[PDB]
Amino acid sequence: MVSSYFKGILLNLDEERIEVLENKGGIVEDEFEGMRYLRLKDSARSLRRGTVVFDEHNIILGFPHIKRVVQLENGIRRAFKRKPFYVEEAVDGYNVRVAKIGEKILVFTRGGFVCPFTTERIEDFITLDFFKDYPNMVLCGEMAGPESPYLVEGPPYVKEDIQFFLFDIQEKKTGRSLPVEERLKLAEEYGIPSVEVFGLYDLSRIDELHALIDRLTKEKREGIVMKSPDMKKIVKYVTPYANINDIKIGARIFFDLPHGYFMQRIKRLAFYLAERKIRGEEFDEYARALGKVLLEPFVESIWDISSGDDEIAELFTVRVKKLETAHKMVTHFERLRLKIHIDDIEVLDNGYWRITFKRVYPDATKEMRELWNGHAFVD
Amino acid sequence: MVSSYFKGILLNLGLDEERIEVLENKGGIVEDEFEGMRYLRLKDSARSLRRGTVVFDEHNIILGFPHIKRVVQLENGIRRAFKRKPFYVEEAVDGYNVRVAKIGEKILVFTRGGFVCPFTTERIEDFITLDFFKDYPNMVLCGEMAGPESPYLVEGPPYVKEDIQFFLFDIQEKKTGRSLPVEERLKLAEEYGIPSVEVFGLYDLSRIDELHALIDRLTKEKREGIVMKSPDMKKIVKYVTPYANINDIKIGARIFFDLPHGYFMQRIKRLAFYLAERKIRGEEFDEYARALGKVLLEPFVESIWDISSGDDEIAELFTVRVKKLETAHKMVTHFERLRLKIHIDDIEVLDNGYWRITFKRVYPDATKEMRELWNGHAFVD
Numbered sequence A: 001m002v003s004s005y006f007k008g009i010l011l012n013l014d015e016e017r018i019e020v021l022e023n024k025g026g027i028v029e030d031e032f033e034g035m036r037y038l039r040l041k042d043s044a045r046s047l048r049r050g051t052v053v054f055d056e057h058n059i060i061l062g063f064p065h066i067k068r069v070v071q072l073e074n075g076i077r078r079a080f081k082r083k084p085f086y087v088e089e090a091v092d093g094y095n096v097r098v099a100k101i102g103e104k105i106l107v108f109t110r111g112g113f114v115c116p117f118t119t120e121r122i123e124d125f126i127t128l129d130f131f132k133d134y135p136n137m138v139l140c141g142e143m144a145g146p147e148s149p150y151l152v153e154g155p156p157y158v159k160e161d162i163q164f165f166l167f168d169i170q171e172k173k174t175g176r177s178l179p180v181e182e183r184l185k186l187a188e189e190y191g192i193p194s195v196e197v198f199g200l201y202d203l204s205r206i207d208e209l210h211a212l213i214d215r216l217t218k219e220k221r222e223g224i225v226m227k228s229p230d231m232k233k234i235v236k237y238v239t240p241y242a243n244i245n246d247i248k249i250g251a252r253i254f255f256d257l258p259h260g261y262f263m264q265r266i267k268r269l270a271f272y273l274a275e276r277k278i279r280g281e282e283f284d285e286y287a288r289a290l291g292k293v294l295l296e297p298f299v300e301s302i303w304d305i306s307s308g309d310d311e312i313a314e315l316f317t318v319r320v321k322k323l324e325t326a327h328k329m330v331t332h333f334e335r336l337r338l339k340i341h342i343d344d345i346e347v348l349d350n351g352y353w354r355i356t357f358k359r360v361y362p363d364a365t366k367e368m369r370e371l372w373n374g375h376a377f378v379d
Numbered sequence B: 001m002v003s004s005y006f007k008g009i010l011l012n013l014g015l016d017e018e019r020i021e022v023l024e025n026k027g028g029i030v031e032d033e034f035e036g037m038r039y040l041r042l043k044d045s046a047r048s049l050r051r052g053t054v055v056f057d058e059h060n061i062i063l064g065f066p067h068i069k070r071v072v073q074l075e076n077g078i079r080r081a082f083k084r085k086p087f088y089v090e091e092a093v094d095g096y097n098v099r100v101a102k103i104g105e106k107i108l109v110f111t112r113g114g115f116v117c118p119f120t121t122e123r124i125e126d127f128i129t130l131d132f133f134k135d136y137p138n139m140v141l142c143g144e145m146a147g148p149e150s151p152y153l154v155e156g157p158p159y160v161k162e163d164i165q166f167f168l169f170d171i172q173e174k175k176t177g178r179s180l181p182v183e184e185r186l187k188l189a190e191e192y193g194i195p196s197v198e199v200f201g202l203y204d205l206s207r208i209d210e211l212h213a214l215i216d217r218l219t220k221e222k223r224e225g226i227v228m229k230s231p232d233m234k235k236i237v238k239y240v241t242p243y244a245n246i247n248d249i250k251i252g253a254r255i256f257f258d259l260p261h262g263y264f265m266q267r268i269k270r271l272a273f274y275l276a277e278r279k280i281r282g283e284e285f286d287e288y289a290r291a292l293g294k295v296l297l298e299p300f301v302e303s304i305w306d307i308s309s310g311d312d313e314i315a316e317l318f319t320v321r322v323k324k325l326e327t328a329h330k331m332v333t334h335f336e337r338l339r340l341k342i343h344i345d346d347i348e349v350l351d352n353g354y355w356r357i358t359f360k361r362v363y364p365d366a367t368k369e370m371r372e373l374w375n376g377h378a379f380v381d
């Protein structure tokens, strides 16, 4: 199942813990272009989910999602008291870790898969000089834009294709984050595209941070991430737009979504309205918007499945340099248990191929259609 | 830890000792007692014997029965359940389920889980006459307790102006659980003066337009909806109004946390399917969108405002009427057994001699979650 070599590296840093992992599928061997690696599908003490192991040194730790606060002022007071913290952009994208492994630059998704799309086009997004000088470091960033393989939308100021946004630089094996100041100096030196840095703030400037959130909401942007200078304390606060747009997109599918998906966003909206003491007409605008994004996409999908045999679907586009990359993506999508096929192809004026993928949602379609056709259930 | 006497009754019903023992081990069957009478309660279902079944002796087995399945699409729900055959349409009443039976020389009232309800048992003779059990000791009256002064619900049907009322919806045989045909049940309710759910009439798929009109009237009257039953009571489905769904959200949003899994999602789904079936669009649709957002956010934001000031917990106040003060204290004890945090907040005597008890239920887990979030606690999704 798993080589004794990988099990051995795991011993460094129970043999039955390894074995239960091996048996349950918590650790699995994988391979990319001949390079074999171990992927941690489940977290094992210090080693988080998404950790990948190629050898003793090439260990790329997974890292978790950033904790959210739903109440900005008290969230800051709890996390930072009155000490300063950096405020950076939260970007609506998917997480990647970029590392040099052997002579190759590989890009890993959150779960620890080598992403064939982002890996092939990595030199379009970043320069490789960084890894010549820092081969033991991992660039952690968001891939975001309107032509994404994993998200239907993204930041509004990315007008085409997709872009990388650095938000952390971590050491291999330890996972240690560089202090903010050092990471920002490295990004400037090596021309690594970065999340926007809004500045250094503290609890006393909460009014300025509320004003920033209001601007970001109007600009249809995701929100902010707050970081101690030493990167040891990090919390995220997202805009009302992020929560409402999330519901709008998810309501098309509705069923078979993550547990609490809509609840979590309703809660973040309520706490924003409570904290900011929004009332009257402004409050009514938000209530109207929440009702529309829960119901309109959902009802439109019901009309879709009521009038034919086609499945609920999402269309998305990406750009690739080689057609073979599109077929490698289809294979990778299938491994992720996603039902995606190539729906359309065009060649761009710059020589890139624009691939239109279509993802269908068979389980949500089936549950929706059964309910439309009168299936009866208890709550 | 279940007696051999009770275990044997189950065996006599064909149940296996390995199932019985596995049930004993998980807690699927537990012994309970009311006023000295010991019985077995099925907290989990055992093959033929559903959850909430209670066993006092060989004859006094009162089967539990599940919630009635809902359809979210009325026309296709009818076609699937009944095809074009006729079915009775009765009111769904927003209340709590009870089973009323004669056990020995006592009339006992059971809630859905198989607990004897101290409140409803004490006041049963206010709601129904006991003549029925003199003639039919082997039958179980199944109904809803509903009204503005309920121990378990904060609201109820708008035409019940005070106190609480019983609404018969089924008559079942002991041990077998067999439901009497609709026509037989209605004849018995008339003969014995048993208060009943409203029967709107006999309908079929071809009359779908009249049923949509009925739902429209019931929504404007702030009523729960309809229950559709084959004459033989073997096929039963329920369809609730937009009001039932919107009001459920409004009430629940005050608490928000620690509610049943999918509570709000289930109701958003029922509104969407109603809007789709009825092809509501434009301004009419916007009115429902405005209403859904208001009932999700306004009660929730109001509770956040509440917990942001002071140390008081999210609470609901409700009243009941009792004949004896001792019944109120038995209710507090019973509420605690159910893991509910309820105390007596106020008491008054009515001009007719009843005691009106005001209970206060507090929600400590929902309060704590909401307060921690207000105070900046950080979590992943």
Ligand SMILES: [Mg+2]
Pocket: A145, A146, A147, A148, A151, A152, A153, A316, A317
């Ligand atoms: Mg897109």
Ligand SMILES: [Mg+2]
Pocket: A092, A242, A245, A246
């Ligand atoms: Mg988003």
Ligand SMILES: [Mg+2]
Pocket: A092, A246
């Ligand atoms: Mg999102």
Ligand SMILES: [Mg+2]
Pocket: B147, B148, B149, B150, B153, B154, B155, B318, B319
């Ligand atoms: Mg009440």
Ligand SMILES: [Mg+2]
Pocket: B094, B248
């Ligand atoms: Mg209800």
Ligand SMILES: [Mg+2]
Pocket: B094, B244, B247, B248
């Ligand atoms: Mg209700």
Ligand SMILES: [Mg+2]
Pocket: B305, B306, B307, B308, B309, B310, B311, B312
């Ligand atoms: Mg208060």
Ligand code: NA
Pocket: A303, A304, A305, A306, A307, A308, A309, A310
């Ligand atoms: Na269609």
